[PDB]
Symmetry: D2
Subunit: 314 residues, 4 copies
């Protein structure tokens, strides 16, 4: 048995770029848009529906309510708030946790028993929050984690070596935020280790690697400073996560998942790690052999998230 219904909670540019990308890719049959501003969600459903006669797939799209979650295979949460003038980061963190809690309680009230995908920032902490408040098994609750950071990394590398970015197999791990890091010890192009690529190609050197990490680190800021917000990138990352689940792919993607003893960092954190996705959610987390530097960086990143969660009394 298979499901083909996704509910999107929050119709800001992240949720709607995701929805539009799904419409253009024909990812699923049925889409339901939820927003605290019901009129806005209705307008967004009109605007999506009006392009369908030109789209690749027959779809059913509507604005709905939490009761529409009941038989949804996936709910994607993008809701949250922005820092107010004078507001501390812990205060805001707590306001976003309360929003996620409320969304998740409303989703669970419907009878929903599918998978939760959190894209709201800070995504690692909010995925943990959603996991705890949902009562669901952690293999059924994920966050988008470093999937977009990873796509950025592949893009940047591809510009040095002029190889299809889809042939670049390297991950950003850890917190989706300032403490993320590149796993260079397990990076290849095609089947070829990155260290060998560096030795072979004049196009890419050791110095470029640190530059690329910085570019990946600064990418969100850079986009926000130029066009107010970033959303096309995450929209396609969320589509890809969705497709791995509905197409039952057993695809390896870096996403926010509960470590739970897989890596030797903090067990009780959601954090960006490569994981196998299929129709049932997370099949398992892939355990990479990290070098000493990367393991240290993963520990640092996990400690940071665990402190955040402690401070939110989670």
């Amino acid at each position: 048995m298979r499901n083909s219904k996704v509910v999107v909670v929050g119709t800001g540019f992240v949720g709607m770029s995701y929805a539009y990308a799904m419409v253009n890719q024909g990812t699923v049959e049925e889409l339901v848009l939820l927003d605290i501003d019901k009129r806005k969600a209705e307008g967004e459903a009109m605007d999506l529906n009006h392009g369908l006669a030109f789209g690749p797939r027959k779809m059913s799209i509507k604005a709905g309510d939490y009761k529409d979650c009941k038989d949804a295979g996936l709910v994607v949460i993008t809701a949250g708030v922005n820092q107010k003038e004078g507001e501390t980061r812990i205060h805001l963190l707590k306001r976003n946790a309360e929003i996620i809690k409320t969304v998740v309680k409303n989703i669970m009230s419907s009878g929903f028993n599918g998978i939760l995908l959190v894209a709201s920032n800070p995504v690692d902490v909010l995925a943990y929050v959603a996991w705890k408040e949902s009562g669901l098994h952690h293999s059924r609750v994920i966050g988008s984690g470093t999937s977009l950071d990873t796509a950025r990394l592949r893009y940047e590398i591809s510009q040095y070596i002029h190889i299809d970015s889809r042939n670049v197999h390297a991950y950003i791990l850890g917190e989706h935020g300032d403490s993320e890091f590149v796993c260079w010890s397990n990076a290849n192009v095609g089947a070829k280790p990155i260290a060998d690529v560096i030795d072979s190609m004049d196009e890419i050197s050791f110095e470029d690697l640190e530059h690329i990490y910085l570019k990946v680190r600064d990418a969100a800021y850079e986009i926000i400073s130029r066009k107010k917000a970033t959303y096309y990138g995450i929209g396609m990352a969320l589509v890809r996560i969705t497709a791995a689940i509905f197409n039952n792919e057993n695809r390896i993607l870096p996403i926010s998942v509960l470590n739970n003893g897989v890596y030797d960092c903090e067990d009780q954190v959601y954090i960006g790690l490569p994981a196998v996705l299929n129709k049932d959610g997370v099949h398992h987390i892939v355990k990479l052999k990290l070098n000493e530097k990367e393991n240290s960086q993963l520990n640092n990143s996990a400690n940071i998230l665990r402190k955040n969660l402690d401070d939110m009394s989670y």
Copy 2:
């Protein structure tokens, strides 16, 4: 010989929804984004590029300048301005005509010799302006016209009769604006005339038709009033027009084209009519047998646009 490069002029939500939809559909290989705010166009190119590692097609995407138009197969113009406090409609009409003129002169300076597609509103008058200022043959300059209105119509009909909207073959003709009208005399579902569908199906009646026309008429307003602007719909319409040209389809779509004696309304207006699109642009305009009411409505619509153009001293 084939081209696979599109330039988008103006990176507001219409131009960028179009670009993102192309990225998700893999419509063409190469995309160049132009905007008077160069930093903004650069941010938009970053945000699109970051989703490519998850996209269906290898692409080259960058922010560029008018010189990048030189070997573009298609330039899509979305630039323009909004009414200022106190501004007359003729004043604003003239300010938009001057913007189009300037864009088009800059495009032609590059050596460009491809096709122009105008999506800026009011699209029928601005397509005529672009045609005149470009010096190009009118088969190489088009506007998006009533292609989106037509998709809306198909969507609305599909909701009554519960048939795939892509099986609904009916057009909105005329001005993309208040004087557009439904061509009911040439409308079918599958191969079946709409009048026969009405007789057969309890699901749809003569009264529903006038309602559907009103819904189509009010659709933009409705969306704008709920989410500030409409853009997902036109984005997919522009993709479809683009695909008909780059895939050399000889596809019939209702778009803004120079009447030029095909219908018996004003010859010297661009107006929404069904037309055959292929790699060379407009192969010919399809001439439908209109009934007396529709012919009158087309004349009214053409007269309105011709008066607009006169008033702009075109």
Copy 3:
């Protein structure tokens, strides 16, 4: 709830062209191949599986047994036999009916409760046979009927008027065989009636229509005489029927369906008529207004099939 499993019974070139086309289009997730020659089905599954690492969709493909039908959403039957030296047409007709009966009993034994799609020839009579032997409701048993004849017709017309064949909306109706006929009274290009197209375009005349009918009539023979058998065409027709069902499209396609009083020809025959397909099978048969000639031709075609069925004591 949605299904994504198809079983193919008979792995000759029709069944396997269908399967390969599905693999290349990514139509469904799961495919099971059945053949009385188990080793052959296993070889075909190997050969399909080996292309998947290059395919657009993750799939599960295997050779199986009738018990694999139990949770299949669709079983496509292509099994049957060829005329032996000296064999009468009624004898062979009866040998094919017994094969279909046996296949269908074996399918039903599994607990299967999905949709049956018969492609074996003569498809209209064998669809009726499959319907009767299955015990299923007639909306859940169909044949491929004149869907391919219809694609041929659209192709031929497109070559005269140089319009995308997918914009040509015209049907072949009746028996998939010598008594099929073109429904010219309900034929259009885009939204434009074919009679108007003829008047407008020097490219197509009344004389061409009879020629086109003859071409469509002779197409199978022509292909068989040049490459031994026809199978790429039907393979893509079967994919399209499958996609209408699994994508729940409410798509109108001409297929073999039980008339049952919809048209005024024989009620108890399966015959090629336009029908609405969705995830539940046939939603309804579309009733076209036929002209006097076409109605007569449909009656002739139905009488022929009814005589065939009588002669088989169905």
Copy 4:
């Protein structure tokens, strides 16, 4: 500038499975089929054309002659002969070399200046022959090499570890034939080296690797013995090679290429190696660090092909 025309020479099941797969994937716009049996090629073009009204892309498909190669971007050669009763392997090798020579001379006579892709067996020797007889630069002449063997390898590995085969990044190198070998030293799943996968997963062990190599070695025989010939697998491999070129991907695929000093085996052989493909053909061969065993195996494989070529007085 971009091309979108492919010519297929030889319409047996390899050439036609390739063509049909392209039609179902919409790989290119224009297809021309050539065969010494012109009637057969015409029948194959009919059978393909008849499915287009149901296909994803508008296409132009016809049977043609060598003059149609003139503006083709790619010619795919599948022509050749089978061993006769009593015939030595060197005799037959020479008969196939003469066929390739004749095809290639006829292609070059047209004015063709695109890329040659040889799929005829033995593909490595015949790619060299085509290269020499064509007068073209070796970056513009390739063979399908071990691309299919590689897809088989990925499929087999995926069945042990239950990961999307498209996440399995490992190559078969060398002769497409008995002396091919797995490059285990440069094999990963996602970004994770295969040795680490073996250590982590109970699902796959060192012993399985030798078994998998044997399965890959025996795959063609196995399929041939069950269904007479193998062709669906190579058909999709050829599509993938084609797509890398027409979509200008800079994609890494293992194909037959002229070693020419890249690896330290024989310089003057075509042999299966990973290579970067884009619109211009082979950008460069990727040089992997091979371990001692693999380097020896590559040398053995190259020596075998060089002896074959010597024996054919190439």
